[PDB]
């Protein structure tokens, strides 16, 4: 329950999705409660416990295909357990029962599916990956046309708290003039709207229906872990699969 | 606390703002608790008590200048009690202590203020007014440049639940063919994203930084009243003022 978030979007018939919160786990501070990350310094046994709880809570049909996220733009087509490499920041699936998933703690998680409910995908979009084109790459994996793809922006660090240096603004500006609107001067730095930037890049590829984007992992401390708030902390995850 | 929502945005020093929920009042079903509306059939005594509670909790400096909302696009500059007509759907103020306020129960409330914190405004944007240009009219009232104006989208009925007939879609398309991206086919009707429409119109005026858009009054029944969900129901309100 409090451990799970159900994306609010015109979800087509044969698709299911969910996102986790820091609530309902067994981990101790700084990972207090539902930490799903096995690589942030938490007790490995606690992480296993939290994953089993969340998987059952979200009714996952199978274990998620965790990726070796490297803040890049590579997408993994989930064709079968035996993979040659899981080094990617997004995954795509058209097979019922296969669970796509991305791990975050401030970075933007994006879930995708077509209106026909036959293809799904999940993308890990920290600022670097987003700037590089992870969302664009994920969209291209779909056989369906972009206009028929809907997307949900998951809980990430919001525009009221996402402070970044000028080099971040420069990186986005060098690739899209409109990215200028997503940065508000904050002293020598800028407050960045990661949701606005995601909507811009998605719109560039032809995606029209984008949902979610109502949260702030930094501010809602009682609900989400935040790397920016607490350098050493837990991790949440967003999942999507064809039923 | 639960009776009030604090807009998450880089609010300048001399500005204050808040938005109510249905929690914390004295009204009974179907207006249970914090109903601030005096024309929806509730106990007038309860509405007064609810108003006193919110005003105190929000720490408003004076009583809100309630408008005779007619779902239009007229903006009322709050220049002094003796008005020829309060028949408007948005108000503007540059006078410390004056409270701008809009009442809603699904319709989109929008709050505005410039980075300098010397001008503010609140708009009631149901689909009719939004389509007519209530947000554009509100921005034009500002002396500051649009790029220096920030906006906060308050709790409204979300796309997953805002089902509208082709007439609503046609109206927006009549104004701008790009508005078509905000309508997802749903049987013989459409699911409209009022936030996306608001962001489109706001961008058109030059406003760059828009916050919020974080809710669904229909779905979050424990937190908001919803006309579409319950025909007979209470009302929430969004406020903003210069200190």
TrEMBL record, chains A, B:
<keyword id="KW-0378">Hydrolase</keyword>
<keyword id="KW-0479">Metal-binding</keyword>
<dbReference type="InterPro" id="IPR003730">
    <property type="entry name" value="Cu_polyphenol_OxRdtase"/>
</dbReference>
<dbReference type="GO" id="GO:0005507">
    <property type="term" value="F:copper ion binding"/>
</dbReference>
<dbReference type="GO" id="GO:0017061">
    <property type="term" value="F:S-methyl-5-thioadenosine phosphorylase activity"/>
</dbReference>
<keyword id="KW-0808">Transferase</keyword>
<dbReference type="InterPro" id="IPR011324">
    <property type="entry name" value="Cytotoxic_necrot_fac-like_cat"/>
</dbReference>
<protein>
    <recommendedName>
        <fullName>Purine nucleoside phosphorylase</fullName>
    </recommendedName>
</protein>
<dbReference type="InterPro" id="IPR038371">
    <property type="entry name" value="Cu_polyphenol_OxRdtase_sf"/>
</dbReference>
<dbReference type="GO" id="GO:0016491">
    <property type="term" value="F:oxidoreductase activity"/>
</dbReference>
<keyword id="KW-0862">Zinc</keyword>
<keyword id="KW-0186">Copper</keyword>
<dbReference type="Pfam" id="PF02578">
    <property type="entry name" value="Cu-oxidase_4"/>
</dbReference>
<keyword id="KW-0560">Oxidoreductase</keyword>
<comment type="similarity">
    <text>Belongs to the purine nucleoside phosphorylase YfiH/LACC1 family.</text>
</comment>
<dbReference type="GO" id="GO:0016787">
    <property type="term" value="F:hydrolase activity"/>
</dbReference>
């Amino acid at each position: 329950m409090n451990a799970l978030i159900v994306p609010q979007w015109p979800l087509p018939k044969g698709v299911a999705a969910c996102s986790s919160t820091r609530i309902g786990g067994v981990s101790l501070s700084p990972y207090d409660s539902l930490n799903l990350g096995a690589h942030c310094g938490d007790n490995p046994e606690h992480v296993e416990e939290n994953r089993k709880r969340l998987f059952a809570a979200g009714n996952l049909p199978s274990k998620p295909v965790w990726l070796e996220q490297v803040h890049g733009k590579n997408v993994l087509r989930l064709t079968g357990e035996p993979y040659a490499s899981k080094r990617a920041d997004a995954s795509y699936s058209n097979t019922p029962g296969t669970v796509c998933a991305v791990m975050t703690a401030d970075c933007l998680p994006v879930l995708f599916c077509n209106r026909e409910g036959t293809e799904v995908a999940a993308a890990h979009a920290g600022w670097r990956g987003l700037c590089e084109g992870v969302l664009e790459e994920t969209v291209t994996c779909f056989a369906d046309k972009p206009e028929n793809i809907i997307a949900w922006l998951g809980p990430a660090i919001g525009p009221a708290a996402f402070e970044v240096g000028p080099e971040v603004r420069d990186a986005f500006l060098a690739k899209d003039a409109q990215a200028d609107s997503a940065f508000l001067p904050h002293g020598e730095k800028f407050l960045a709207d990661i949701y606005q930037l995601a909507r811009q890049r998605l719109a560039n590829t032809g995606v029209e229906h984008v949902y979610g984007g109502d949260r702030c992992t930094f501010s809602e401390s009682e609900t989400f872990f935040s790397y920016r708030r607490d350098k050493t902390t837990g991790r949440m995850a967003s999942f999507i699969w064809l039923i």
